[PDB]
């Protein structure tokens, strides 16, 4: 799972090397940046219910066609799966912020996504609208400090780019 330490350890292992100065120094960076991203993680863990509801509501306000027959939100149960998916992604974002890298999103959210969404008629623009809204709705200092906001927005942008 990609993080500061697993990336330097995988490079060390490939070269048959003990950890050396640049490896330890990399881990120091992880120590420095942790306060900002763990602040963001904590805010998201405390506030996810309202974040997920706003994001889902925005999807269907932006794309009411999704509720029409033959589309991805054409039953209550499919509408709920959409909000569930948003919840899954926000949870994966919480995990990225805790780990300090994209591993959780890469492995559990992004890999295979395009194939699944294609097979199930799930337009990627719906997901993008959810994340773009979430990104731009958040503000510092109210919701978190400015560096925590940078961290939060970076993972949202990361998933937006993977889907667009």
């Amino acid at each position: 799972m990609k993080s500061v330490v697993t990336t330097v350890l995988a490079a060390a292992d490939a070269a048959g090397r003990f950890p050396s100065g640049s490896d330890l120094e990399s881990v120091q960076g992880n120590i420095q940046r942790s306060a900002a991203r763990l602040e963001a993680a904590e805010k998201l863990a405390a506030g996810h219910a309202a974040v997920v509801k706003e994001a889902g509501d925005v999807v269907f306000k932006k794309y009411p066609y999704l509720k029409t027959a033959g589309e991805a939100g054409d039953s209550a149960e499919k509408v709920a799966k959409c909000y569930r998916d948003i919840d899954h992604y926000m949870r994966l974002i919480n995990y990225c912020l805790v780990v300090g890298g994209t591993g959780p999103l890469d492995e559990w959210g992004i890999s295979g996504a395009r194939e699944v969404y294609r097979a199930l008629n799930l337009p990627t623009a719906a997901y993008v609208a959810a994340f773009q809204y979430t990104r731009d709705r958040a503000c510092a200092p109210r919701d978190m400090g400015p560096q925590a906001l940078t961290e939060f927005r970076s993972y949202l942008d990361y998933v937006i780019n993977a889907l667009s």
Binding site: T6, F18, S20, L24, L38, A41, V98
Partner: protein
């Protein structure tokens, strides 16, 4: 591989849970002890050649049959292979200590090792002794109690880090039993 943080993420994911206050606090403590962990790793890597050669030599001086005719350290080729294996295990132990998690050691080193050694005829009790000597060695350097070489670090307590390192050597031994 996993680290201390992704390990907590795997647990939260098994519960479909977010990581927040409660679970985040133990990880903040891990971060606060980060500089010490870096020193602990530097203590082993800075002495890697000494740790390995002393452990293999100690294994041999306690069991001279290993370098007798048909012993598994007999010939320079076998002695070199054993020294190499000592270094491989130590290297993966340092990886584990830097990551704060045993997965890199289990997945990339210990998985299949017992079967490999049984197929080759590498004597497992002797390997376990080599690992034990490296454990004593590595832990002394972490605690700055090595008899012939000291390491200057800020004054404090690294007992938890020394115990964690010890546990990774113990997992190496357990994977061979």
């Amino acid at each position: 591989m996993l680290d201390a943080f992704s390990k907590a993420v795997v647990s939260a994911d098994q519960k479909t849970g977010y990581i927040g206050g409660a679970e985040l606090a133990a990880l903040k403590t891990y971060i606060a002890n980060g500089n010490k962990r870096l020193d602990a790793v530097n203590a082993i890597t800075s002495n890697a050649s000494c740790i390995v050669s002393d452990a293999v030599s100690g294994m041999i001086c306690e069991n001279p049959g290993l370098i007798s005719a048909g012993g598994n350290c007999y010939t320079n080729r076998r002695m070199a292979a054993c020294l190499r294996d000592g270094e491989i295990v130590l290297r993966y132990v340092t990886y584990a200590l830097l990551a704060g998690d045993a997965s890199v050691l289990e997945d990339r080193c210990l998985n299949g090792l017992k079967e490999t050694y049984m197929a080759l005829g590498v004597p497992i009790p002797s390997a376990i002794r080599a690992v034990s000597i490296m454990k004593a060695s590595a832990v002394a350097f972490i605690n700055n109690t090595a008899s012939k070489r000291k390491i200057e670090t800020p004054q404090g307590d690294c007992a938890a880090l020394a115990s964690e390192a010890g546990s990774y050597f113990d997992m190496a031994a357990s994977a061979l039993r």
